[PDB]
Amino acid sequence: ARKYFVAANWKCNGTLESIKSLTNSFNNLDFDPSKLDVVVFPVSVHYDHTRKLLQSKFSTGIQNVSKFNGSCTGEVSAEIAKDLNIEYVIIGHFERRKYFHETDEDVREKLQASLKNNLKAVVCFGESLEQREQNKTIEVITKQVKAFVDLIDNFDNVILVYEPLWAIGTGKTATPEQAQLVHKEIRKIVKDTCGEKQANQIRILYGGSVNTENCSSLIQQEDIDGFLVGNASLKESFVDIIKSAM
Amino acid sequence: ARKYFVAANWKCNGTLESIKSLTNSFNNLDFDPSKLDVVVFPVSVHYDHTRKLLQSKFSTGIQNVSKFNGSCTGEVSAEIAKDLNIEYVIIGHFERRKYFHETDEDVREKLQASLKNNLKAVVCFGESLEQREQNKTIEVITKQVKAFVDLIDNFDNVILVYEPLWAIGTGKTATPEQAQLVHKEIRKIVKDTCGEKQANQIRILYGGSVNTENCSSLIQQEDIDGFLVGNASLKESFVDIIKSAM
Numbered sequence A, B: 001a002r003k004y005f006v007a008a009n010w011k012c013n014g015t016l017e018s019i020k021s022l023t024n025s026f027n028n029l030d031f032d033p034s035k036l037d038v039v040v041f042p043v044s045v046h047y048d049h050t051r052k053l054l055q056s057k058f059s060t061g062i063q064n065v066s067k068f069n070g071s072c073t074g075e076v077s078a079e080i081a082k083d084l085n086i087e088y089v090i091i092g093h094f095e096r097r098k099y100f101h102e103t104d105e106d107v108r109e110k111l112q113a114s115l116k117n118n119l120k121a122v123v124c125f126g127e128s129l130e131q132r133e134q135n136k137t138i139e140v141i142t143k144q145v146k147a148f149v150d151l152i153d154n155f156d157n158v159i160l161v162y163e164p165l166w167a168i169g170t171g172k173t174a175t176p177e178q179a180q181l182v183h184k185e186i187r188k189i190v191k192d193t194c195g196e197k198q199a200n201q202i203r204i205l206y207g208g209s210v211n212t213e214n215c216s217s218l219i220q221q222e223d224i225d226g227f228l229v230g231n232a233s234l235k236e237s238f239v240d241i242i243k244s245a246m
Helices: A016-027 A044-053 A078-083 A094-099 A104-116 A129-133 A137-146 A176-194 A196-201 A215-219 A238-243 B016-027 B044-053 B078-083 B094-099 B104-116 B129-133 B137-146 B176-194 B196-201 B215-219 B238-244
Strands: A004-009 A036-041 A059-062 A088-091 A120-125 A158-162 A204-207 A226-229 B004-009 B036-041 B059-062 B088-091 B120-125 B158-162 B203-207 B226-229
Touching: A004 A204, A004 A238, A016 A044, A016 A238, A036 A088, A044 A059, A044 B044, A044 B078, A078 A104, A078 B044, A088 A104, A104 A120, A104 A137, A120 A137, A129 A137, A137 A176, A158 A176, A176 A196, A176 A204, A176 A215, A215 A226, A226 A238, B004 B203, B004 B238, B016 B044, B016 B238, B036 B088, B044 B059, B078 B104, B088 B104, B104 B120, B104 B137, B120 B137, B129 B137, B137 B176, B158 B176, B176 B196, B176 B203, B176 B215, B215 B226, B215 B238, B226 B238
Parallel strands: A004 A036, A004 A226, A036 A059, A059 A088, A088 A120, A120 A158, A158 A204, A204 A226, B004 B036, B004 B226, B036 B059, B059 B088, B088 B120, B120 B158, B158 B203, B203 B226
Antiparallel strands: none
């Protein structure tokens, strides 16, 4: 029933040439975009090069958007993104929260501005290692998800991403069972706050050191609908991660 | 002699169409780029469009660059900028210091990263209303400039910008004499730390509500070498500001 979603997140990475080579390899995979969404999130200044090189089957997005007051924070606004026809934005990703102290309240506000401007939003959340050790995973996730999920209107256009912070960029990936357990709870939170039909439509991705070895067991899980992929998305074998969802 | 430098900074705005019409009006101005530097700093995702539309006599740049640490901050790196042939970078601009708590040490590091990658740097600093009311202007400026000025190597490639914070975006522009007095003291810091020849070469710009009515009286002052212009640089009349420096 629900369409899988696989996303590449190219984080502070790339040159004109490396993108050229990588896009060409991605373009060599045949998949049907009416069946599978595949989205690439390049560095801001590489967005146009990247969109120009990727075939229309690939969707594209940017990695952050501002809240939404006149005083310019130097982030890209949702209005600017719409005018450039940028289809997706990421919100709440680890680095915004870690370096820029972005809050749950900021996350909500960003989702508001994205939806107001007809952008599709990939909204990220997850617990720290300490929180997981302190047996606080569900509490954390619950608070993070309920900061924004009632704003969701069309449940094809907001994608939730569970990324435990300890898995991001570390090679330490969640087991399928660790992930599933959290996704199952996330979908229940959507059910209880937005309705059953909506909870069953919305995509909930895992991210955190997803690779060609582990992707099949993850996606097999029933409440895991695809992935946000960092390091592994910089290599040509990313195509095999996409295939895991085909 | 010392080459004048006028910069447009387009803060969180534009659309594809507004840039088309604005760049067109700019391109109608005949000036000699061997005699006058004119740099346009668009939003990141508008860099490509803007650069394609502006004639070669305009230089271009980005509004921020990251420090050199394995966990990506989402900012564009100096390396990426060089690979894109982005000529200039702004460092230390007010929003970074205010919204993201960017420090003088951060500014030093960004300058180090920029020069390591052959980027030319437009380095901004300035006091608050409170600091100025508390007679601390010269002390504040001095700490800010001494944070990085020693790293300067080629004194054509780093440009200093005095923007008192109370003048930025407010309409409340510094008088010629307010700015001149600071500019003299900046240039002396440079003479004392870097050498007299170097101090006479470096450009020191004023920014903070420069407009078509005030720009002539500012540029006339001996130690003001140009401008960084926000709100006024979104209008077709910005050409008249460039003309005050021709």
